[PDB]
DNA sequence: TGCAAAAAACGCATATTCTCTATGCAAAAAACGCATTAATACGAGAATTTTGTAGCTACTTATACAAAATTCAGGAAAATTTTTCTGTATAATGGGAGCTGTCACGGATGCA
């Protein structure tokens, strides 16, 4: 539920990363791969929401995708 | 402007005579013969002698085992670059972008 609940601000990552040469949706479903990768290692008794930590994953999970994703030649990040 | 007609030239009488056609002289070529000498070739002698044939001998090579002294193909470390994975903590709370001037056809639904 909290997962499904924290599925609004995600649009921020979508907008910031439009589609990253892919698809708005795929740039949010891959962001969903985040969310879960928050909860778990979201950190309770922390002192504030994953609003500064959930994103964190989010944007580190998209990116990784995005560019893993999408040019039909994988690229090394280097 | 018709000729009859005269003198000198221009045509029928020979000397001259002089290119001229005509034979004996003579001088040196030539070529023929007496011929002489030398040289081009035949006769004999034995001397070199190369080629042709045999056996011995030295060089050259046919061959049979193989790990020479050297090449190479993997195998397994590094070495450094690169790749994939994981992680970094305030708040942030519904998405733009053309379709609106085509003509005609064939179903297929909706709407009383």
UniProtKB/Swiss-Prot annotation:
<protein>
    <recommendedName>
        <fullName>RNA polymerase sigma factor SigA</fullName>
    </recommendedName>
</protein>
<comment type="function">
    <text>Sigma factors are initiation factors that promote the attachment of RNA polymerase to specific initiation sites and are then released. This sigma factor is the primary sigma factor during exponential growth.</text>
</comment>
<comment type="similarity">
    <text>Belongs to the sigma-70 factor family. RpoD/SigA subfamily.</text>
</comment>
<comment type="subunit">
    <text>Interacts transiently with the RNA polymerase catalytic core.</text>
</comment>
<feature type="short sequence motif" description="Interaction with polymerase core subunit RpoC">
    <location>
        <begin position="26"/>
        <end position="29"/>
    </location>
</feature>
<feature type="region of interest" description="Sigma-70 factor domain-2">
    <location>
        <begin position="2"/>
        <end position="72"/>
    </location>
</feature>
């Amino acid at each position: 539920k909290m997962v499904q609940s924290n599925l609004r601000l995600v649009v921020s990552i979508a907008k910031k990363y439009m589609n990253r040469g892919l698809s708005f949706q795929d740039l949010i479903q891959e962001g969903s791969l985040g969310l879960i990768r928050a909860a778990e290692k979201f950190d309770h008794e922390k002192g504030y929401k994953f609003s500064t930590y959930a994103t964190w994953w989010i944007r580190q999970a998209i990116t990784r995708a995005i560019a893993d994703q999408s040019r039909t030649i994988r690229l090394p990040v280097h």
